[PDB]
């Protein structure tokens, strides 16, 4: 259960909600539902120590609660200042109504 992490059921997350996944001995992840699509990034804002799962999802844009920085949850690319460092993006797979997230990020 390290390559793919069992998160939750696909219909157990309303379009435009965020869910935090605690991995043991590594940084937590954030899984977002934008409409019918699922995406995942590191949970930790790249600008500090804020948890992005306590931010505001506005479509495909997560707003950090600390300084109002933001990221595209699809690309992980910064969407508002002061964020400049891209989030780690984690592949999600919906296999049999079941949400799985990669235990390792795509290579930058």
């Amino acid at each position: 259960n390290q390559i793919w992490l069992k998160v939750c059921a696909a219909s157990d997350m309303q379009p435009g909600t965020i869910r935090r996944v605690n991995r043991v001995g590594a940084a937590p992840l954030a899984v977002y539902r934008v409409g019918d699509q699922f995406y995942a990034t590191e949970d930790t804002c790249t600008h500090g120590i804020a948890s992005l799962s306590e931010g505001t999802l506005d479509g495909d844009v997560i707003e950090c609660p600390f300084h109002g920085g933001a990221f595209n949850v699809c690309t992980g690319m910064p969407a508002s200042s002061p964020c400049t460092v891209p989030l780690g993006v984690f592949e999600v797979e919906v296999k049999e109504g079941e949400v799985y997230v990669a235990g390792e990020k795509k290579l930058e």
Partner: protein, 389 residues
């Protein structure tokens, strides 16, 4: 509204604290030592941007705003205390009672309709532990205990200290004081060597967000505060490495100091034990104006009697004040000053890049935002503004 609304919109976690540039109204603050104000010798100071006049009358302290109601002059420009219980403005002789600020006489027109219908602002004053506290707020004050750290007011605790004006916003001084990792600036302090202290370079934190601090909002006397618990599940760093090579070591002494660090509203740090294992440090960062604060340093040591207290006053005057309050905390003064430019336009509050030990500061910023007793504004300084519907 001390700060651009667009900055306040961005700092959702702690907007009130970022707004509190002039400090928090409706708290007690230490401003001077009892011995610096003598019977019938009024003393001037500025606190939360307000010019104040303190006087001692039959040994008791009273505080008036130093600003005549009429044309807004400081009474202190030419003090005319003509009776024991009054002060007369040197300009047109409006006369105020110390005890309640009532305009009780005008020498230049004893028939004025203003007599008995106007009131100069007063602030409560309390002496504790040789320290003068002023309640910079409105109406009935809370007990001093609410706004002092645990054990400051204890019967056994002998308090010695000093006070000076430092050119930084009070919040920079608070955050420097409660910052677990700032201990790096103290690595070469004369006091670490001459008092055989153990002093790490920093901490590798362990556990989760919640275990880094204890947020006290349930004390019996109403204190609101944060304990720094980075040390409980965290590893002290004694070997500082660059590319895996050791370039600096911490201090290896037997004396364990500063186990127990807490910040309290309205902005007072308790460090226990420090600078010695039988003592505590209590320090205030009192807002004077947006650019300035009192660095009100006190050292507590339980003495049981006259004998102890005189030895402690000797090792305070000979060792602690120079080795610790100066030789250790001088680094804290210039560290605070070094943060002024980044925060001066309020941009620092958006652009800072925090790391893990800043959990303690973040907990302080949220605690201060949620449990302060009001934001001092420029309107409190010049005169409150309100338009009808």
């Amino acid at each position: 509204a001390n700060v651009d609304e667009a900055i306040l919109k961005r700092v959702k976690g702690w907007a009130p604290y970022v707004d509190a540039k002039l400090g928090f109204r409706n708290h007690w603050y230490p401003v001077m030592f009892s011995k610096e104000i003598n019977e019938g010798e009024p003393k001037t100071l500025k606190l939360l941007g307000e010019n104040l006049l303190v006087n001692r009358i039959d040994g008791k302290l009273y505080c008036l705003k130093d600003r005549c109601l009429h044309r807004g002059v400081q009474l202190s420009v030419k003090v005319e205390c003509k009776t024991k219980s009054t002060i007369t403005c040197w300009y047109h002789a409006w006369t105020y009672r110390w005890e309640d600020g009532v305009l009780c006489d005008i020498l230049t027109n004893p028939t004025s309709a203003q007599i008995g219908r106007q009131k100069l602002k007063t602030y409560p004053v309390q002496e504790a532990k040789g320290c003068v506290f002023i309640y910079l707020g409105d109406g009935d004050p809370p007990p001093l205990a609410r706004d002092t750290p645990p054990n400051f007011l204890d019967d056994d605790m002998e308090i010695l200290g000093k006070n000076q004006i430092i050119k930084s916003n009070w919040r920079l001084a608070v955050e420097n004081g409660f910052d677990p990792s700032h201990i790096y600036i103290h690595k070469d302090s004369i006091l670490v060597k001459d008092n055989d202290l153990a002093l790490p370079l920093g901490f590798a934190p362990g556990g989760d967000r919640k275990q880094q601090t204890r947020v006290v909002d349930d004390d019996v006397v109403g204190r609101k505060g944060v304990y720094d618990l980075i040390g409980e599940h965290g590893v002290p760093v004694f070997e500082g490495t660059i590319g895996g090579e050791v370039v600096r070591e911490g201090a290896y002494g037997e004396k364990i100091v500063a186990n127990d660090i807490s910040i309290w509203l309205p902005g007072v740090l308790k460090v226990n034990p420090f600078p010695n294992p039988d003592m505590m440090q209590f320090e205030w960062y009192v807002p004077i104006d947006e650019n300035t604060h009192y660095y009100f340093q006190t050292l507590g040591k339980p003495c049981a009697n006259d004998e102890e207290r005189k030895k402690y006053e000797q090792e305070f005057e000979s060792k602690w004040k120079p080795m610790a309050l100066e030789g250790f905390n001088n680094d804290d003064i210039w560290a605070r000053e070094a943060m002024v430019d980044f925060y001066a336009d309020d941009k620092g509050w958006v652009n800072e890049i925090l790391f893990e030990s800043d959990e303690a500061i973040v907990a302080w910023r949220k605690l201060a935002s949620e449990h302060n007793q009001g934001i001092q504004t420029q309107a409190h300084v010049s005169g409150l503004e309100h338009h009808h519907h």
